[PDB]
Design an enzyme around this catalytic site. Structure first.
Site, PDB file in Angstrom:
ATOM      1  N   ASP A  92      -9.076  -2.970 -10.495  1.00  0.00           N
ATOM      2  CA  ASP A  92      -7.735  -3.057 -11.010  1.00  0.00           C
ATOM      3  C   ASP A  92      -7.828  -3.245 -12.524  1.00  0.00           C
ATOM      4  O   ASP A  92      -8.829  -3.643 -13.091  1.00  0.00           O
ATOM      5  CB  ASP A  92      -6.954  -4.149 -10.341  1.00  0.00           C
ATOM      6  CG  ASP A  92      -5.445  -3.988 -10.480  1.00  0.00           C
ATOM      7  OD1 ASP A  92      -4.974  -3.029 -11.089  1.00  0.00           O
ATOM      8  OD2 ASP A  92      -4.744  -4.927  -9.993  1.00  0.00           O
ATOM      9  N   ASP A 261      -5.955  -3.125  -0.180  1.00  0.00           N
ATOM     10  CA  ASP A 261      -6.755  -4.299  -0.586  1.00  0.00           C
ATOM     11  C   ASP A 261      -5.921  -5.542  -0.376  1.00  0.00           C
ATOM     12  O   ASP A 261      -4.713  -5.464  -0.603  1.00  0.00           O
ATOM     13  CB  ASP A 261      -7.250  -4.251  -2.018  1.00  0.00           C
ATOM     14  CG  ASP A 261      -6.157  -4.545  -2.985  1.00  0.00           C
ATOM     15  OD1 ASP A 261      -5.358  -3.611  -3.306  1.00  0.00           O
ATOM     16  OD2 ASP A 261      -5.981  -5.707  -3.436  1.00  0.00           O
ATOM     17  N   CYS A 299     -13.804  -8.641  19.524  1.00  0.00           N
ATOM     18  CA  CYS A 299     -14.456  -8.378  18.240  1.00  0.00           C
ATOM     19  C   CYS A 299     -15.953  -8.194  18.369  1.00  0.00           C
ATOM     20  O   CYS A 299     -16.671  -8.972  18.994  1.00  0.00           O
ATOM     21  CB  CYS A 299     -14.163  -9.564  17.322  1.00  0.00           C
ATOM     22  SG  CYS A 299     -14.855  -9.367  15.667  1.00  0.00           S
ATOM     23  N   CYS A 301     -18.088  -8.458  15.836  1.00  0.00           N
ATOM     24  CA  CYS A 301     -18.805  -8.937  14.685  1.00  0.00           C
ATOM     25  C   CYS A 301     -19.916  -9.932  15.029  1.00  0.00           C
ATOM     26  O   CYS A 301     -19.948 -10.501  16.098  1.00  0.00           O
ATOM     27  CB  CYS A 301     -17.850  -9.534  13.667  1.00  0.00           C
ATOM     28  SG  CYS A 301     -17.447 -11.277  13.814  1.00  0.00           S
TER      29      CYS A 301
HETATM   30  N1  BGU Z   1      -2.210  -2.962 -11.703  1.00  0.00           N
HETATM   31  C1  BGU Z   1      -1.482  -3.314 -10.662  1.00  0.00           C
HETATM   32  N2  BGU Z   1      -2.025  -4.092  -9.746  1.00  0.00           N
HETATM   33  C2  BGU Z   1      -1.304  -4.588  -8.678  1.00  0.00           C
HETATM   34  C3  BGU Z   1      -1.871  -5.498  -7.786  1.00  0.00           C
HETATM   35  C4  BGU Z   1      -1.041  -6.033  -6.811  1.00  0.00           C
HETATM   36  N3  BGU Z   1      -1.267  -6.984  -5.857  1.00  0.00           N
HETATM   37  C5  BGU Z   1      -0.186  -7.096  -5.191  1.00  0.00           C
HETATM   38  N4  BGU Z   1       0.023  -8.036  -4.258  1.00  0.00           N
HETATM   39  N5  BGU Z   1       0.808  -6.350  -5.624  1.00  0.00           N
HETATM   40  C6  BGU Z   1       0.313  -5.689  -6.700  1.00  0.00           C
HETATM   41  C7  BGU Z   1       0.875  -4.737  -7.540  1.00  0.00           C
HETATM   42  C8  BGU Z   1       0.056  -4.248  -8.558  1.00  0.00           C
HETATM   43  C9  BGU Z   1       0.600  -3.345  -9.630  1.00  0.00           C
HETATM   44  O1  BGU Z   1       1.781  -2.931  -9.568  1.00  0.00           O
HETATM   45  N6  BGU Z   1      -0.207  -2.962 -10.620  1.00  0.00           N
HETATM   46 ZN    ZN Z   2     -15.493 -11.516  15.056  1.00  0.00          ZN
END
Ligand code: BGU
Ligand code: ZN
Ligand code: BGU
Ligand code: ZN
Lengths: 363, 363
Positions: A92, A261, A299, A301
């Site tokens: 990110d 994620d 599961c 695992c």
């Molecule tokens: N760069 C970026 N990262 C994100 C990470 C995030 N995590 C959640 N829960 N929402 C999110 C939105 C964005 C987002 O709008 N932009």
């Molecule tokens: Zn497990």
């Protein structure tokens, strides 16, 4: 492998399953990415993350720029060799992580003092050696008025163009990594459309749906996905940032999302929450103190093969590190088993039945 | 295997190397036992403890009686199945763990309220399913006057007899486990002799040197060992409780000790201290922030094969669980490599040279 190739092998409704091929490996889609914010998936060795089935993990520009430093990691050989994960890494851009400032058209300065901008974010992601680089954006706060959402989205689209140009100007990065754009527009259809159009005009390797999982609640999130995902190019991956709970993932795949994620399996595992096909349980509850069953009955695992609920209950109540390790490995393995059941069901044309069955039992 | 068989394969001076055979496995001596006080060796799966070379681990009557409870563990199938360690386990009796009370000839009550006595300690160790049961004793505080040391040792010898009779009265325990006696007497030769004699008259499977590693310092500890270990039966294992640092272990083996335990590799690993053949280092030190070498240059452990000092530095400074895991695995593997080098050197008749070489470099 190629720098980047997304192929769709099967479809059901808006759902898709396929593969992303990159130089460091293949990513099976729909994909869940364990989060490794501080250059570690918390309480797991990278070999354990891979044994659960993960093909790719997430890192964060913001956190790593602060500690240990992006230039430091580059000097040490990049994030993959630093942490011992040799498969793809998505990072990110720092556009969310306002969560943790002086903003201007140029970028954001924040509290020592630091700066991020489209150019500096892309540079940091290069120094880390990220495989999937996220454009530098603004995650619009929720709720937002239409005016504020529009202003914010427009700035993000100008930042998306600057991100594209910064990535392309660095030959090694352009030749070896991929760049994803992030759609904004809050909950407003017309702003989501304008953002999709802007991003597709610039052109990216994949498209994230940003600005969700910020407090809006599932019904609303799903309503926004219903109109927003079809706006994005069909032939590129669709990444829903920060999502989510198992039910959120299933419904998002039903709406065309390919990548996910979230910290929920790792963070809530350390706090005692275990995912099961009959819903989450809190292992700290005294009802588990003499329960010899595994966390989950089906599961596969290594945790469920070897240890009981009673033992893990003891470990978490005692604050033992092995409790965090075991809970986290199970929860990440559960998420990867969920993604495998989703992939196989789409491949077999029975995902809608799977989704209904999943929900009936999980709830 | 037999219930218990100690065989001495080679000797050099007062040092010995050999094997203890028990129903759950073979213990190579001299042996280091990782400590697993709360039914876990902190931050390690049992398979990782075994991969470092450990043959036996230590548990504690005091801690496990409090949490999760001895009767609870028995109902769940015993300590081995609870924690997933299927090899021998030695349990301390609670006679040290005054460290963490109303004392009488009958036993000790302590702060909920609990009680321990020779009979109750041996019973708890049976409920846990311990393989090597320690007699219930009094670890005499240091320093002690000769009068107080004598009174304390005499009580421990009466408790040793009660321990023997309690163990022998339980047929399943007597047939499947071993019982060790604990010598007391503080730093006084005549009281150590009286205690050895009392213990040998009762007869045990092995003999611990108690009452050391309680603040006396190496020179004094070694002086006490010089006269105390020869007092114990030569044909049974000699266990020095709570020792110790790598140099303490080498000198204790030179004085006839066969078995060791201590929290130093686990506890100090979580705090940043890594053992190396050139002495301990504190990985938190800024000098390691860009050091690409492994913790130790010769170590064969999986940590040293895969990660740098720089990464582990980062993890410990960030408070990440993986830092505790990695530091602990390396330190336990280092201790087991030390014990293997000791065993091989005694077997080859070159332990005194090894001990000198070790010290010259470690210091
Ligand atoms: N760069 C970026 N990262 C994100 C990470 C995030 N995590 C959640 N829960 N929402 C999110 C939105 C964005 C987002 O709008 N932009
Ligand atoms: Zn497990
Ligand atoms: N039962 C018992 N346990 C012990 C454990 C110890 N740990 C260290 N450091 N010294 C110790 C002495 C004793 C001792 O004398 N008796
Ligand atoms: Zn090592």
């Amino acid at each position: 492998r190629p720098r980047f190739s997304f192929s769709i092998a099967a479809r059901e409704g808006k759902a898709r399953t396929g593969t992303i091929e990159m130089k460091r490996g293949v990513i099976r889609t729909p994909a869940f990415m364990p989060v490794g914010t501080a250059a570690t998936v918390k309480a797991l060795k990278p070999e354990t993350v891979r044994a659960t089935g993960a093909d790719i993990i997430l890192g964060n520009t913001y956190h790593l720029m602060l500690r240990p430093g992006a230039e430091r990691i580059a000097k040490l050989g990049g994030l993959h060799s630093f942490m011992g994960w040799d498969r793809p890494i998505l990072t990110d851009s720092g556009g969310y992580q306002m969560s943790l400032t002086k903003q201007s058209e140029e970028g954001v300065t924040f509290k020592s003092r630091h700066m991020l901008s489209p150019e500096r974010s892309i540079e940091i992601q290069h120094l880390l050696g990220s495989d999937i680089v996220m454009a530098f954006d603004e995650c619009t706060p929720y709720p937002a008025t239409p005016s504020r959402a529009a202003s914010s989205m427009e700035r993000s689209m100008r930042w998306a163009k600057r991100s594209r140009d910064a990535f392309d100007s660095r030959k090694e990065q352009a030749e070896n990594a991929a760049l994803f754009g992030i759609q904004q527009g809050s909950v407003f259809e017309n702003l989501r459309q304008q953002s999709a159009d802007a991003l597709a005009e610039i052109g990216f390797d994949g498209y994230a749906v940003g600005g969700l999982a910020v407090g809006e609640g599932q019904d609303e999130m799903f309503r926004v996905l219903d109109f927003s995902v079809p706006m994005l190019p069909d032939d590129k991956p669709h990444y829903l940032m920060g999502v989510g709970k198992p039910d959120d993932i299933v419904g998002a795949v039903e709406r065309g999302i390919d990548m996910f994620d979230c910290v929920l399996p790792t963070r809530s595992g350390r706090n005692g929450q275990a995912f099961t096909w009959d819903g989450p349980i809190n292992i700290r509850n005294a009802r588990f103190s003499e329960d010899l069953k595994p966390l989950d009955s089906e599961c596969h695992c290594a945790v469920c093969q070897k240890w009981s609920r009673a033992y893990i209950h003891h470990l978490i109540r005692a604050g033992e590190i092995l409790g965090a390790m075991l809970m986290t490995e199970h929860n990440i393995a559960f998420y990867q088993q969920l993604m495998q059941k989703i992939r196989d069901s789409i491949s077999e044309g029975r995902f809608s039945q799977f989704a209904q069955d999943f929900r009936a039992r999980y709830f």
